[PDB]
């Protein structure tokens, strides 16, 4: 009946928003990550780190605002407010990119908080912790992309910036520099995300179209009771439908729902792995055998060589403005260009 | 193209010619597919989380369900009571019919929109163009992330089908 | 000395065989191009 | 095409070893029943 147990009592009270011990970590950090993003996108520029406007105050819209990465010259500095770079000056902190580390790091501890919360509530309520397990995939993606990837590179500057259009630029950077679409770890991720959405749609559609008539209304939603024992749709008819339509069907409700966990979670883990490789520029960029042939044989052409020409265009036309700290100066005559364009 | 690298070629050139990423119907497509994967994992994990103990630790839990049994195999009230507490109560479904309809409708509608995106960029109604939308008091252009996207788009444009254009505008 | 009490049978049903072979064949199909390079 | 000569055996073992593992386990499951 000591203080630790009294606090435990209070943190775990059943209230509108459950708190828990995990709440101590989660709620400050989530709110601060989210406040940092909203604050930066409304008020803070990227002029000195990127040579970019990036807030509503400067004239940007919701698609173009961003909290942008620190300047390349910061290396991987934690950029603490009190550190040697900002030296406690809040304004300079904002201008050097300190809000990016702020959001990234509070965001990471919030994501931990959130998964501990899924563990905490699962234990109190008495259920198996698979929702927590599944959330490991979002965490793997976040840390590999926002933390591991820029740590292998020269600086945080090459991490994603927290913005809609900024993330689009990150997509295109990865195409032109890393040829990431060619990476089989991205391809497994594509399959898991697209396979997940498929499974989501096809499982919902099936349940809704093998419903049992359990009421008399044309709205079939009313005819369900959450404490009823009986299944609300026919697994037998669903199995026959799909067997006859597609050749094979699920027959085991448990396998079905495990597979729905398995497919998208695994795909996200796979894509995280390939990004770890790209942290080191360990790309699936080329096929050697294709290049040897093409170098010797100028009539040889595939969609593979066509895409590298596109990559080479991306790199040369975007690098000067996207990597301003490098002072790239490409005279017009060196820019790769096809005929006329 | 009916090929893996051919697909990527199609999607890089589509971005140069239509700025599909800045198009809201492709953004709804991403939200349809991201959300669908999210809710697939959520739903799979919540049902798996609330399976009723029917087996020992030496057997797959999947043998706790027999094809064609009448009783549900998980406890939706325990799953609702976990997820309602993870967020808050009224953000969680306890009607299984509403729930699976939501699962059906979210990705289907997202993918409707992204298909309509391609179908309407077919007639050259393209993604938002904020190229040089921010300029300063003198009139200097102040680049944004959209202008950086545009530099990438230009390099795809100028390089694609490098022998095929004789005139200065790629009008189709 | 008694025989070991902790031994257990292992199983792989036919559906798991089909699923695993498909997984392996598709992985091979995907990665083989990178092994030939 | 000038491809990595070991690509073949990598691919063969990559297919054969894990498939053989599953077949072994399947057949001895059937013989229990």
């Amino acid at each position: 009946r000591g203080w630790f147990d009294i606090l435990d009592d209070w943190l775990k009270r059943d209230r509108f928003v459950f708190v828990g011990w995990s709440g101590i970590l989660l709620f400050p950090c989530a709110y601060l990550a989210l406040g940092g993003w909203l604050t930066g996108t409304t008020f803070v520029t990227s002029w000195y780190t990127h040579g970019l406007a990036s807030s509503y105050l400067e004239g940007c819209n919701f698609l173009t605002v961003a909290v942008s990465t620190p300047a390349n010259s910061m290396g991987h500095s934690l950029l603490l407010l009190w550190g040697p770079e900002a030296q406690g000056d809040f304004t300079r902190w904002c201008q050097l990119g300190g809000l990016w580390t702020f959001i990234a790091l509070h965001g990471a501890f919030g994501l931990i908080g959130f998964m501990l919360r899924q563990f905490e509530i699962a234990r109190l309520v008495g259920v198996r912790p698979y929702n927590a397990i599944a959330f490991s995939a979002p965490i793997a993606v976040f840390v590999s992309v926002f933390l591991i990837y820029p740590l292998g590179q020269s600086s945080w500057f090459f991490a994603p910036s927290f913005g809609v259009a900024a993330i689009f630029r990150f997509l295109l950077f990865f195409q032109g520099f890393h040829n990431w679409t060619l990476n089989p770890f991205h391809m497994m991720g594509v399959a898991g995300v697209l396979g997940g959405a498929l499974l989501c749609a096809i499982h919902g559609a099936t349940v809704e179209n093998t419903l049992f008539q359990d009421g008399e209304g044309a709205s079939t939603f009313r005819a369900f009771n959450p404490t009823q024992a009986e299944e609300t749709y026919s697994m037998v008819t669903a199995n026959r439908f799909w067997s006859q339509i597609f050749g094979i069907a699920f027959s085991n409700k448990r396998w079905l729902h495990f597979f729905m966990l398995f497919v998208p979670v695994t795909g996200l883990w796979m894509s995280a792995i390939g990004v770890v490789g790209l942290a080191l520029n360990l790309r699936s960029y080329d096929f050697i055998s294709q290049e040897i042939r093409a170098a010797e044989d100028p009539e040889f052409e595939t969609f593979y060589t066509k895409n590298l020409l596109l990559n080479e265009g991306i790199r040369a036309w975007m690098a000067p403005q996207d990597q301003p700290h490098e002072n790239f100066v490409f005279p017009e005559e060196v820019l790769p260009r096809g005929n006329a364009l | 193209p009916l090929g893996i690298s051919g697909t990527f070629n199609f999607m890089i050139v589509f971005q140069a010619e239509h700025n599909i990423l800045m198009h809201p119907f492709h953004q709804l497509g991403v939200a349809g597919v991201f959300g669908g994967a999210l809710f697939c994992a959520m739903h799979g994990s919540l049902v798996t989380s609330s399976l009723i103990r029917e087996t020992t630790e030496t057997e797959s839990a999947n043998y706790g369900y027999k094809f064609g049994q009448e009783e549900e195999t998980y406890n939706i009230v325990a799953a609702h009571g976990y997820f309602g507490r993870l967020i808050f109560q009224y953000a969680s479904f306890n009607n299984s019919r509403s729930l699976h309809f939501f699962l059906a409708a979210w990705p289907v509608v997202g993918v409707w929109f992204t298909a309509l995106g391609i179908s309407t960029m077919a007639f050259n109604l393209n993604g938002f163009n904020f190229n040089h939308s921010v300029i300063d008091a003198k009139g200097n252009v102040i680049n944004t992330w959209a202008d950086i996207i545009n530099r990438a788009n230009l390099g795809m444009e100028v390089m694609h089908e490098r022998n095929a254009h004789n005139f200065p505008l790629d009008l189709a | 000395m008694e025989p070991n009490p902790n031994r257990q049978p292992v199983e792989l049903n036919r559906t798991s065989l089909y699923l695993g072979l498909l997984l392996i064949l598709v992985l091979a199909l995907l990665f083989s191009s990178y092994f030939f390079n | 095409m000038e491809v990595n000569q070991l690509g073949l055996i990598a691919t063969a073992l990559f297919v054969l070893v894990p498939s053989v593992f599953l077949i072994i386990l399947y057949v001895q499951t059937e013989s229990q029943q």
């Binding site: 050749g247 094979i248 | - | 064949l25 | 073949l8």
Partner: peptide
């Protein structure tokens, strides 16, 4: 050799499809 390998794997996948469909464990009720 690489062509033969690619086609061989694809052919095995098609054969697997045939057995997965026509020689599945039959779902039996209750």
């Amino acid at each position: 050799m690489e062509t033969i390998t690619y086609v061989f794997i694809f052919a095995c996948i098609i054969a697997l499809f045939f057995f997965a469909i026509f020689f599945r464990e039959p779902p039996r009720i209750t």
